[PDB]
Design a binder for this molecule. Structure first.
Ligand code: HEC
Length: 99
């Protein structure tokens, strides 16, 4: 934006980003408390499939919903921090990763 800079018709360059990967997003937002799918804050609440499913957290979209209003000691993630597409990726990684 110099004095001589011209108007543009082009728009939306800002949002032309790659889709982030689930593993990286997990490492960034979750692995601190859930390393290797465990739980360092509440030891009984691991991400092991049977345990997630005991509370009805069965699918990718169950994960992506759970993080919006989770249990004590876990922060809630709203949609500015973890947009819907990113929530799905994190759900995918949880389901693909922790038996
Ligand atoms: C620590 C500050 C946490 C961060 C960051 C994340 N989680 Fe978490 N998680 C944490 C606690 C203390 C608990 C137990 C809450 C309770 O009910 O007592 C959990 C639980 C989960 C679960 C399972 C819920 C259940 O079985 O009832 C899941 C599926 C889960 N957490 C996923 C998850 C994801 C995907 C995160 C990053 C986006 C994440 N957690 C962050 C502690 C913390």
């Amino acid at each position: 934006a110099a004095s001589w800079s011209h108007p543009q018709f082009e728009k939306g360059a800002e949002t032309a980003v790659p889709n982030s990967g689930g593993g990286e997003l997990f490492a960034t937002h979750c692995a601190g408390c859930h390393p290797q799918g465990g739980n360092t804050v509440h030891p009984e609440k691991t991400l092991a499939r049977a345990r997630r499913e005991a509370n009805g957290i069965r699918t990718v979209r169950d994960v992506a919903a759970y993080i919006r209003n989770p249990g004590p000691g876990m922060p809630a993630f709203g949609e500015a921090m973890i947009p819907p597409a990113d929530a799905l990726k994190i759900g995918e990684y949880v389901v693909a990763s922790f038996p």
